[PDB]
Amino acid sequence: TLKYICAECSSKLSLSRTDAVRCKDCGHRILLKARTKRLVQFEAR
Amino acid sequence: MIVPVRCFSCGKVVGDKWESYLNLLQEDELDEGTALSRLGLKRYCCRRMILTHVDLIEKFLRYNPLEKR
Amino acid sequence: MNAPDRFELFLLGEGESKLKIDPDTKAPNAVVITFEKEDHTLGNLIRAELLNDRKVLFAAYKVEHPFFARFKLRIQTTEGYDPKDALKNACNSIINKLGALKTNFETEWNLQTLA
Amino acid sequence: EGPQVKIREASKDNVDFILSNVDLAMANSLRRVMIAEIPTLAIDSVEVETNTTVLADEFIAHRLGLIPLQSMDIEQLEYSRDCFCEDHCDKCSVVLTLQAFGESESTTNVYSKDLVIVSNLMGRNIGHPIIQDKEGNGVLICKLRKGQELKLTCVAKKGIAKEHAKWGPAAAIEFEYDPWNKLKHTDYWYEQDSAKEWPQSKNCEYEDPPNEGDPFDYKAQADTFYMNVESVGSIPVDQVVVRGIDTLQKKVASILLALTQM
Ligand SMILES: [Zn+2]
Ligand SMILES: [Zn+2]
Ligand SMILES: [Zn+2]
């Protein structure tokens, strides 16, 4: 499923729509979505 | 935040002189002017580029990484 | 947002040429040449080399607006002397002087040993 | 015959010389071309694969664009605009890669020596980041706490300082003429005495001081310009001057070609 990261643990999680948004390792309720896999282009100017 | 790569006014590369500057200030106990002169910064544009820099990245490095691998 | 692309300072756009010449009606035997994608670097040099010419009665240039990289150059010569010919002579003189300077600087640099 | 040059000092990055028997317009045009018109290589595009640092992606992209790169053989490279590839190829670009990881408990410094050329340089002498200090580490691109990672790929094209100052190889260019003000091109602001209050330039030793009794010379023109050209490091300073002269000559030749063709 979609990947998230615990705000405290930094552990990686995979959560579905019905999953409660918590960190399995520590129970923190704040999660940050993972970086996109599509390449990002930046002009160096 | 972190030392600029080039002097804003003239464009001299000063991003490779930050560590040498700090080493001169700390290890050799030189005052700022002599260290700046030693590094080759003669125009006061470059001298203000290196002299007035505030290295905030150190503070940023104290917080634990958000995405830790 | 409204900033123009920087390459518009030196790249000719679609449907425009480097030079355009318009006859001038204020004075006889005079032309105004618009240089596109150029600035003071070329205009001042060309104008001065024109003013070194003895058969050029009038030579001036102006950049009407800093926003746009173009400049106008007015040339008026004596009767029987085409201003285009004056421009050609000025350009040829500039090229010859720059070639001589390049040769001299190369020779002077080769004479060095501490570099 | 023509403009005469006599160079006082030569170094790896500075050349101090005198340019005599030349017009003021020609010297100024050469100075401007050296500042703005010389082609050079610099990082133009950045693909960021991973950035867990404390700096923003475009922050690091901007810093990378400002890294000086070897541009000795830049004339053998093409402009990306007039290359027949789709986005970038080997005939018009140099591909570098930065890959740093924070495996040490102390801060790990990401320098410009860590940049690795991945494209095939085809024997050219372009692309290598310029290293100047004695330690061998180039520009300090970034810093990494333990566990932080930075993976990215740079594409470097050739450009000129007009498009962006990151392509400027010239740094500062000292330019002076008539140190004694014999041409009276300036009116010296003063309180009590102009001569005492205005420090003499170092070039005053190379000209005869005025006699203080002679009349003003209204026929003398401006020549004998003292010029000091510095190099960022992308190309040797002598090559900076030579390529500036070549670029100005090319501009004038293009004017002639357009005039003839029309
Ligand atoms: Zn957790
Ligand atoms: Zn500076
Ligand atoms: Zn290509």
UniProtKB/Swiss-Prot annotation, chain A:
Question: According to its UniProt record, where is this protein located?
Answer: Nucleus, Nucleolus; Peroxisome
- Give a GO cellular-component term: RNA polymerase I complex
Enumerate the residues binding Zn(2+).
6, 9, 23, 26
Keyword Nucleus found = yes
PTM notes: The N-terminus is blocked.
* A single BP term in Gene Ontology: transcription elongation by RNA polymerase II
Q: A Gene Ontology MF term for this entry?
A: DNA-directed RNA polymerase activity
> What ranges of residues constitute the C4-type zinc fingers?
6-26
List the keywords (alphabetical): DNA-directed RNA polymerase, Metal-binding, Nucleus, Peroxisome, Ribosome biogenesis, Transcription, Zinc, Zinc-finger
* Biological function: DNA-dependent RNA polymerases catalyze the transcription of DNA into RNA using the four ribonucleoside triphosphates as substrates. Common component of RNA polymerases I, II and III which synthesize ribosomal RNA precursors, mRNA precursors and many functional non-coding RNAs, and a small RNAs, such as 5S rRNA and tRNAs, respectively. RNA polymerases are composed of mobile elements that move relative to each other. In Pol II, the core element with the central large cleft comprises RPB3, RBP10, RPB11, RPB12 and regions of RPB1 and RPB2 forming the active center.
Family statement: Belongs to the archaeal Rpo12/eukaryotic RPC10 RNA polymerase subunit family.
Any miscellaneous information on file? Present with 907 molecules/cell in log phase SD medium.
Protein name, please? DNA-directed RNA polymerases I, II, and III subunit RPABC4
UniProtKB/Swiss-Prot annotation, chain B:
> Where are the residues linked by the Glycyl lysine isopeptide (Lys-Gly) (interchain with G-Cter in ubiquitin) cross-link?
59
Record SUPFAM superfamilies: RNA polymerase subunit RPB10 (SSF46924)
Listed Pfam families: RNA_pol_N (PF01194)
Chain sites annotated for binding Zn(2+)? 7, 10, 45-46
Q: Which UniProt keywords apply?
A: DNA-directed RNA polymerase, Isopeptide bond, Metal-binding, Nucleus, Ribosome biogenesis, Transcription, Ubl conjugation, Zinc
GO molecular function annotations of the record: DNA binding; DNA-directed RNA polymerase activity; zinc ion binding
- Can you supply a Gene Ontology BP term from the record? transcription by RNA polymerase I
Principal location class: nucleus
Quaternary context: Component of the RNA polymerase I (Pol I), RNA polymerase II (Pol II) and RNA polymerase III (Pol III) complexes. Component of the RNA polymerase I (Pol I) complex consisting of 14 subunits: RPA135, RPA190, RPC40, RPA14, RPB5, RPO26, RPA43, RPB8, RPA12, RPB10, RPC19, RPC10, RPA49 and RPA34. The complex is composed of a horseshoe-shaped core containing ten subunits (RPA135, RPA190, RPB5, RPO26, RPB8, RPB10, RPC10, RPA12, RPC19 and RPC40) where RPA135 and RPA190 form the DNA-binding cleft.
Q: What else is known?
A: Present with 5300 molecules/cell in log phase SD medium.
Entries under PANTHER family matching the protein: DNA-DIRECTED RNA POLYMERASES I, II, AND III SUBUNIT RPABC5, DNA-DIRECTED RNA POLYMERASES I, II, AND III SUBUNIT RPABC5 FAMILY MEMBER
Q: Could you tell me what this protein is called?
A: DNA-directed RNA polymerases I, II, and III subunit RPABC5
Organism per entry: Saccharomyces cerevisiae (strain ATCC 204508 / S288c) (Baker's yeast)
Swiss-Prot record, chain C:
Alphabetically, the GO molecular function entries are: DNA binding; DNA-directed RNA polymerase activity; protein dimerization activity
The reported result of mutating residue 108 to K is: Transcript termination readthrough. Lethal
Query: In which broad location class does this protein mainly occur, judging by the first location in its UniProt entry?
Result: nucleus
Q: What keyword terms does UniProt attach to this protein?
A: DNA-directed RNA polymerase, Nucleus, Transcription
Q: Which family does it belong to?
A: Belongs to the archaeal Rpo11/eukaryotic RPB11/RPC19 RNA polymerase subunit family.
HAMAP family given in the database record: RNApol_arch_Rpo11 (MF_00261)
In its UniProt entry, what is this protein called?
A: DNA-directed RNA polymerase II subunit RPB11
The record lists the organism as: Saccharomyces cerevisiae (strain ATCC 204508 / S288c) (Baker's yeast)
Swiss-Prot record, chain D:
- Molecular function terms in GO for this entry? DNA binding; DNA-directed RNA polymerase activity; metal ion binding; protein dimerization activity
So where does Zn(2+) get bound?
A: 83, 85, 89, 92
What are its GO biological-process terms?
A: RNA-templated transcription; termination of RNA polymerase II transcription; transcription by RNA polymerase II; transcription elongation by RNA polymerase II; transcription initiation at RNA polymerase II promoter
Ordered alphabetically, the record's keywords are: Acetylation, DNA-directed RNA polymerase, Metal-binding, Nucleus, Transcription, Zinc
Write down the superkingdom of origin: Eukaryota
Entry's localization field? Nucleus
Q: Which GO terms describe its cellular component?
A: nucleoplasm; nucleus; RNA polymerase II, core complex
Q: Does the keyword Metal-binding apply?
A: yes
As for family, the record states: Belongs to the archaeal Rpo3/eukaryotic RPB3 RNA polymerase subunit family.
Job of this protein:
DNA-dependent RNA polymerase catalyzes the transcription of DNA into RNA using the four ribonucleoside triphosphates as substrates. Component of RNA polymerase II which synthesizes mRNA precursors and many functional non-coding RNAs. Pol II is the central component of the basal RNA polymerase II transcription machinery. It is composed of mobile elements that move relative to each other. RPB3 is part of the core element with the central large cleft and the clamp element that moves to open and close the cleft. Seems to be involved in transcription termination.
Q: What else is known?
A: Present with 10000 molecules/cell in log phase SD medium.
Its protein name is: DNA-directed RNA polymerase II subunit RPB3
Relative to the complete UniProt sequence, the shown stretch is 4 to 265 of 318
